[PDB]
């Protein structure tokens, strides 16, 4: 149907906008602490601690399969990156502090993205 295609064009445009959002958030992690999944080889107990791991590469695969239906879903995954890190690592660690900084800096980007998603439909 023509409706199905119009829907698909909106998903595609959302995917375009989320890709740019993703790039901007990832620039706020110049150390690449959140680039890749936590290694189960190097942290064998990780899944005893963290039930839903997340990282920027895993978000990027979902993105390019057009697997985010709305900004809320995308934000949930971004928040997992931050929240997982702040639970697993202590406050006095480079990792915890990197999450805080990403959260604070990401807030600005996400604030405007929400306006753009509402605005452009």
Swiss-Prot record:
Tissue specificity: Highly expressed in testis.
Start and end residues of each Bromo domain: 9-113
Domain of life the protein comes from: Eukaryota
Covalent cross-link (Glycyl lysine isopeptide (Lys-Gly) (interchain with G-Cter in SUMO2)), residues: 41
Protein localization: Nucleus; Chromosome
Quaternary structure note: Component of some HBO1 complex composed of KAT7/HBO1, MEAF6, ING4 and BRD1/BRPF2. Component of the MOZ/MORF complex composed at least of ING5, KAT6A, KAT6B, MEAF6 and one of BRPF1, BRD1/BRPF2 and BRPF3. Interacts (via PHD-type zinc finger domain) with unmodified histone H3. Interacts (via PWWP domain) with dimethylated and trimethylated 'Lys-79' on histone H3.
Reported function: Scaffold subunit of various histone acetyltransferase (HAT) complexes, such as the MOZ/MORF and HBO1 complexes, that acts as a regulator of hematopoiesis. Plays a key role in HBO1 complex by directing KAT7/HBO1 specificity towards histone H3 'Lys-14' acetylation (H3K14ac), thereby promoting erythroid differentiation.
Annotated protein name in UniProt: Bromodomain-containing protein 1
Upper taxonomic lineage: Eukaryota, Metazoa, Chordata, Craniata, Vertebrata
